[PDB]
Design a protein around this ligand. Structure first.
Ligand SMILES: *[C@@H]1O[C@H](CO[C@@H]2O[C@@H](C)[C@@H](O)[C@@H](O)[C@@H]2O)[C@@H](O[C@@H]2O[C@H](CO)[C@@H](O)[C@H](O)[C@H]2NC(C)=O)[C@H](O)[C@H]1NC(C)=O
Ligand SMILES: *[C@@H]1O[C@H](CO[C@@H]2O[C@@H](C)[C@@H](O)[C@@H](O)[C@@H]2O)[C@@H](O[C@@H]2O[C@H](CO)[C@@H](O)[C@H](O)[C@H]2NC(C)=O)[C@H](O)[C@H]1NC(C)=O
Ligand SMILES: *[C@@H]1O[C@H](CO[C@@H]2O[C@@H](C)[C@@H](O)[C@@H](O)[C@@H]2O)[C@@H](O[C@@H]2O[C@H](CO)[C@@H](O)[C@H](O)[C@H]2NC(C)=O)[C@H](O)[C@H]1NC(C)=O
Ligand SMILES: *[C@@H]1O[C@H](CO[C@@H]2O[C@@H](C)[C@@H](O)[C@@H](O)[C@@H]2O)[C@@H](O[C@@H]2O[C@H](CO)[C@@H](O)[C@H](O)[C@H]2NC(C)=O)[C@H](O)[C@H]1NC(C)=O
Ligand SMILES: *[C@@H]1O[C@H](CO[C@@H]2O[C@@H](C)[C@@H](O)[C@@H](O)[C@@H]2O)[C@@H](O[C@@H]2O[C@H](CO)[C@@H](O)[C@H](O)[C@H]2NC(C)=O)[C@H](O)[C@H]1NC(C)=O
Ligand SMILES: *[C@@H]1O[C@H](CO[C@@H]2O[C@@H](C)[C@@H](O)[C@@H](O)[C@@H]2O)[C@@H](O[C@@H]2O[C@H](CO)[C@@H](O)[C@H](O)[C@H]2NC(C)=O)[C@H](O)[C@H]1NC(C)=O
Ligand SMILES: *[C@@H]1O[C@H](CO[C@@H]2O[C@@H](C)[C@@H](O)[C@@H](O)[C@@H]2O)[C@@H](O[C@@H]2O[C@H](CO)[C@@H](O)[C@H](O)[C@H]2NC(C)=O)[C@H](O)[C@H]1NC(C)=O
Ligand SMILES: *[C@@H]1O[C@H](CO[C@@H]2O[C@@H](C)[C@@H](O)[C@@H](O)[C@@H]2O)[C@@H](O[C@@H]2O[C@H](CO)[C@@H](O)[C@H](O)[C@H]2NC(C)=O)[C@H](O)[C@H]1NC(C)=O
Ligand SMILES: [Ca+2]
Ligand SMILES: [Ca+2]
Ligand SMILES: [Ca+2]
Ligand SMILES: [Ca+2]
Ligand SMILES: [Ca+2]
Lengths: 388, 388, 388, 388
């Protein structure tokens, strides 16, 4: 017997440490590796797992040509051992999906899988391997979700979902799902949040989601949620913004609205509230998806004149490609450990990646209450060695 | 401890939703994937699985040349993770077979595996991995079975078996098998059914099988069976027929006999009775194995002047190849969820599939009591990219 | 908790039925498959497994060249799912070995693994994965064992071992091993048996072993053994001999000594005593390792004028290559089911197998108390398609 | 439920016997095998496992070129079935690491993983798959550890760690870690030990570590440790030295200090104290990493005029390449069985290994209280057959 996961507080931490790295593109030189993108990580009682949206093709084969395309019927959410490259001999196919979220409730896995036509998509809810429920597109404009792990408290899982325009007003909802059955949803209040995509969430008593405003906000919108309702919303106060693109530091302190500067598009990212402070992942570049660093901003969660970047860890150099990033948690006795993954995109449309495909590798870090060292953990592939 | 599966009613449903898709041919471009055909799906307490008849060769190798041939000693029933491509590193060999059925009784797997000479074949019964019993060909003319999952109620499994001509009167039986031991068989009454092949079965209190009349019926024959005997037989009343080939809609309403029009040959297919209504899978083409759709026919299960196609889901376009299709169930608390798979055949003898082999990929859908969206989920292989 | 396996009687049976077939050579065309020989099968509580002596090389690679060689340091006993081809992604390495036996005692696996120099070899005893004991070569002349499953009764496992000349008087012993610890051994009495190699054993209350006389006997020597001692010895009385080479039928009835005709060399084979009758596997050819059939000889176990081949199943045609064969059992409630495997050797030194390597596939059959059909289940590889 | 491992005495033994061998380079001819080095073995309750530092590339691909380099971000500690070659379909990625140690405490696995910049590395502590603690480089000079299994007694695991110069005075510590949490560390006393690297440890009531002095000692330094503190230190008294390089036999008897002859560099190695005697692994060559033998030295553990090599097993000939070697234990009822692995390095910078990569295979032996035979178990690859 296993109990449902509880509303534990986030563990104390003061730095992030290298965890698992798959080197998937390097290992894919001989065409063994499945083409993926939008990876994430999520753990159950026994294992942490890599998840990603496969493209139904092997890296470097003719079918991998043109996998820059975001949505096809040939995409499936797949799962593979954390830190391993996804290959036919080790992967599991979770569901047909070109957008997804997964989370373990303490007893079983839940997955949310969107597929079908852009104007008529549906989200399948999988629980314990069985399709238990669904969401029908209501705005008929690319129904979509987090692309990282959802969160579950006392048996009720929470997941953020969007339907509508990428660069205009759309609908954003949170769904509460218990044992695979949709209990209720709420439209996210628009009193502060103006656009919301690809939420990266974690648990610190309540669920916190830090997301992507793809329209007007170079700062990231956020929500606080429990097993019943949305408790709080806003934008991360930090005058050091963390979307891409974004203005150079220092920028505007906007706790309650989008910055309105360098607003679109964006990239999936994450953060961790720590008291009044906030940790924020971000590309090193302010314009491109290159490099990765995480900063701690003193009093960055609140309205304050005292915002300072007290810590900056540079984990992937600006000379290396990054991509999406997202939070995940690991139960650590009486608290949840904050961890994250970074998608390292290789191929189109990256300048000088002269291949016809698009894929990624993964690297991950976890938070400890110890002082970190330093290093650099990029994709590491010589694109010139790769089958095109 | 696990109890035997019970005679649960079918769950309510109003549409079908995309579940798992393997993209096996696309992923087989580099010769990793095992050549298969006649796939199906069946689940135990912990997992749903893909099953298929392998051809003892890797796709695109010289040994794959000529795998259009239906029966060889080199065919085995194999099992692999649902939605994954079958590769040497993930498959399990269940038994030597060129015709098969599998089902889980709540405690153990049973399999029925036919092999040997066309005139002298035998069916091996496997239970919990042990060969427990057998059936010797009695008409000496290709002893054969469902090519999809059998069904088990309160420990007794039921499976439909045929021996005799493909386009003339043959023998059709149901066998009752408990813990791998044949308890009894019955010759299917011929008062209504005139020819019966490749039954697709499910459970709705009793076992329902919807099969293939390969001789005179463009409508599908069906049986209702419990743990003791055949309770009822007939043909699906729907004036919209669901075999291939078949007449255009609307055709004849024949509850008690074969249509006698476009009667032979046929293709394995499935349906689900829903009150007085019936859901029917079928190729989009009325002549070829191209496309796949599922229709709901109001009062289609009964003798009525009111037959209308209230719902039509087009899941694979008529421009894409399909093949066999079959039902499977997933336990959903106090009811069984109706699901199905579609075999997507590529290679010989499909027009313009210029390769020497014959194989397939798989796609699956499950029923929910929600409104579906729409999409298209075909094999997706560019045959021109494939090793021939 | 699991009890030790008990001394159950052999199940009733009247024919043999096709079980699992791996098609390993066919599937090895693209160099995925590990080079093996001397395969066998053995089962635990949950699964039956294939075992074989690998050659530390992939089929069709340069390192596979010359794998006709019997003993090298690069040979390991490996285990893989029954009926699957052995590949790097599915195999387990049991121990370093160029001769081996394996058996499950009801709780754990035991293995006997010989390796090292021809004149100074040692047998490692593995139990529950731990090396627990060993046998040092005492005649310093290729210490060797069954190349099929040993047998275990009430926790005590029995295994036949040989050290000395291949075509002259050597030492033959049985070892009793409990939980991996050698309890005792006995020199096999030479009052009847004159040469003994590669015993194929099974359980029918007591352990029966039917072996290979490589010197003077075209008939097979046999032993009856319990958990304490050798109870009985002899040669199979059947005037229809079952070694290879051997005289044509009918030959000599020799219950107590070697035939003294077509005496050497031989091939590993098996049989099953059934009352006063005996079932005997044998190559179809009387001179070569081609084809495979199993005969039932009425009163073949005893001294009688009434020996007749009442049954003959031809399972592999004389036009196809065979090789070693061996017995294994599967627990069937209150009796043991008799099964066997046949090694299908391809490559050197088989005439017209124009490749530089030597390997094999596997096929298996089990006994049922039903009448069999007929078929042909040979290796099935087109040697011309294979990498050389 | 499982108890923590206890402080058992080492089992009696009088020779070493061939256990598992992977033949990884031979099997890597077709580019399936992951590039590794610094392998080791460690076991839990159910299985023994191979561990190694992968290089994030497949053997024989372009990315394998230049893998002689010791530290990169693309190295991960990986785990694979003991005696199997590491391939994408069977490996698990444990953590990012270019130096590592692993050990099972009776309940869960602990790992120590160093990565990052040479001057700023950190060691991540993994326990039950979760990152639980860390060590920050304190001398900022390649923080590093055993490259073989650590040891755990009554829930407290012990591991030797080094930071500082390779050929001058550095810092050497032992860390005590319980359930992944660092309890304490001790600086190793320098009253006898002058340099310490790559400890090979085992349990004989207390933990014994036999290590590598890379500076002044051709004899190996050693420590005795319990769950609380370092109990004893020294150098192995044996006048027959066991590092590489080293003086020819007989050399100096130095129980309390480095030999001061042929002092640097060295190679990772191991030994086993047996009463007043000692068993010592060593390369056959006194100058190079070729061959492998194990000697027993009578009274070799103590100050004595009676040192004699009573036993010498030559396991890999001087004509074959060896490399690092290390101890591991297997629980054997009421004692621990001493076993070891030998890394068989192929590629750069080995003379005449004309390839661009560097990797290894593995061979293993275990101790029994029986007399051994003899043999030779080298890597076995024909380097000329390999992709360069
Ligand atoms: C939602 O969970 C609560 C328990 O969690 C607490 O309240 C949440 C809103 C959130 O603030 C958490 O962090 C808190 O720990 C459930 O409340 C229980 O309800 C039962 C039945 O009425 C009652 O017997 C218990 O006393 C309640 N427990 C507590 C701690 O108050 C509530 O039922 C959950 N709601 C849903 C819709 O599932
Ligand atoms: C990746 O694919 C493009 C496009 O391929 C073409 O269209 C595809 C849908 C498919 O039908 C292919 O068979 C077609 O070739 C390739 O670009 C083409 O390259 C060819 C050959 O050099 C050229 O003649 C065409 O004009 C190109 N077509 C377009 C639209 O640009 C491209 O070469 C492929 N990349 C790699 C690395 O193979
Ligand atoms: C077959 O199953 C029945 C129980 O299932 C019920 O009856 C079936 C014919 C079918 O209609 C199902 O949907 C029903 O739920 C077994 O009947 C039981 O028999 C035992 C022993 O006589 C008796 O004690 C129970 O009361 C019966 N249970 C019920 C519900 O009537 C029957 O034994 C099964 N037959 C065989 C041959 O296995
Ligand atoms: C697929 O196989 C056919 C037939 O192969 C021939 O017969 C087989 C049983 C086997 O023995 C092969 O070695 C034979 O080649 C191939 O058709 C043949 O192609 C060759 C070469 O072009 C031609 O000379 C023969 O006349 C053909 N034979 C027949 C009966 O048509 C075919 O080319 C193979 N397809 C592919 C893609 O390789
Ligand atoms: C060997 O096994 C016997 C039990 O098996 C029986 O005797 C064998 C020789 C063989 O004929 C089997 O087929 C029989 O079923 C063990 O005998 C038991 O010994 C214990 C302790 O003395 C005694 O209490 C039991 O009564 C005995 N059981 C029987 C059935 O007689 C014997 O101990 C075993 N010997 C060894 C060395 O392990
Ligand atoms: C299989 O191997 C033989 C022998 O290979 C030679 O000796 C080996 C130990 C190794 O060192 C190889 O590099 C050697 O080539 C091959 O037979 C040789 O073939 C070559 C080239 O045709 C010829 O010049 C030699 O005289 C042959 N040597 C002998 C002893 O016959 C054989 O070709 C290989 N088979 C295949 C299919 O590759
Ligand atoms: C360390 O372990 C001891 C038990 O192991 C014994 O003492 C070690 C130092 C070592 O010599 C082993 O080989 C010995 O077997 C723990 O001692 C126990 O402590 C508890 C609590 O005080 C006490 O109740 C028990 O009696 C002690 N057991 C024994 C055998 O003395 C000790 O707690 C451990 N220390 C740490 C820091 O974990
Ligand atoms: C292994 O690699 C070396 C070096 O490769 C060069 O530098 C690498 C970092 C990478 O950028 C490669 O593309 C470069 O080629 C190879 O040595 C080179 O070989 C080329 C071609 O013969 C030669 O022109 C260069 O001068 C060499 N460079 C150096 C520094 O020596 C080497 O050939 C590779 N080995 C194999 C087996 O492929
Ligand atoms: Ca933005
Ligand atoms: Ca028909
Ligand atoms: Ca003979
Ligand atoms: Ca491959
Ligand atoms: Ca040294």
């Amino acid at each position: 017997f296993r109990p449902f996961k509880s509303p534990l507080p986030l563990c104390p931490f003061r730095g992030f440490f290298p965890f698992h790295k798959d080197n998937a593109i390097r290992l894919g030189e001989n065409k063994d590796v499945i083409v993926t993108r939008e990876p994430y990580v999520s753990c159950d009682n026994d294992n942490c797992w890599s998840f990603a949206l496969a493209q139904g093709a092997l890296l470097g084969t003719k079918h991998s040509n043109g996998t820059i395309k975001d949505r096809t019927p040939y995409r499936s959410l797949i799962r593979f051992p954390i830190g391993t490259a996804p290959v036919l001999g080790n992967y599991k196919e979770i569901c047909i999906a070109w957008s997804s979220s997964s989370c373990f409730d303490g007893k079983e896995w839940m997955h949310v899988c969107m597929t079908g036509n852009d104007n008529d998509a549906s989200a399948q809810i999988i629980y314990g391997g069985r399709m238990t429920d669904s969401i029908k597109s209501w705005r008929k404009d690319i129904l979509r979700t987090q692309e990282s792990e959802c969160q579950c408290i006392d048996g009720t899982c929470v997941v953020a979902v969007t339907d509508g325009p990428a660069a205009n007003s759309a609908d954003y909802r949170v769904y509460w799902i218990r044992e695979g059955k949709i209990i209720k949803y709420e439209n996210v209040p628009k009193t502060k949040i103006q656009h919301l995509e690809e939420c990266s969430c974690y648990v610190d008593i309540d669920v916190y989601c830090i997301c992507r405003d793809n329209w007007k906000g170079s700062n990231r919108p956020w929500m606080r949620i429990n097993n019943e309702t949305i408790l709080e919303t806003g934008y991360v106060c930090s005058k050091f913004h963390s979307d891409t693109p974004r203005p150079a530091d220092p920028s505007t302190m906007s706790c309650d609205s989008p910055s309105n500067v360098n607003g679109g598009p964006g990239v999936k990212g994450f953060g961790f509230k720590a008291g009044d402070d906030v940790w924020l992942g971000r590309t090193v570049s302010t314009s491109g998806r290159s490099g990765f660093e995480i900063i701690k901003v003193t009093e960055g969660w609140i309205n304050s004149p005292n915002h300072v970047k007290s810590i900056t860890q540079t984990l992937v150099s600006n000379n290396d490609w990054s991509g999406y990033s997202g939070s995940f948690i690991v139960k650590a006795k009486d608290c949840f450990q904050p961890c994250f993954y970074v998608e390292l995109i290789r191929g189109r449309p990256n300048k000088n990646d002269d291949v016809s495909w698009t894929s990624n590798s993964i690297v991950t870090f976890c938070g400890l209450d110890n002082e970190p060292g330093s290093g650099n953990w990029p994709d590491g592939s010589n694109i010139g060695f790769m089958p095109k």
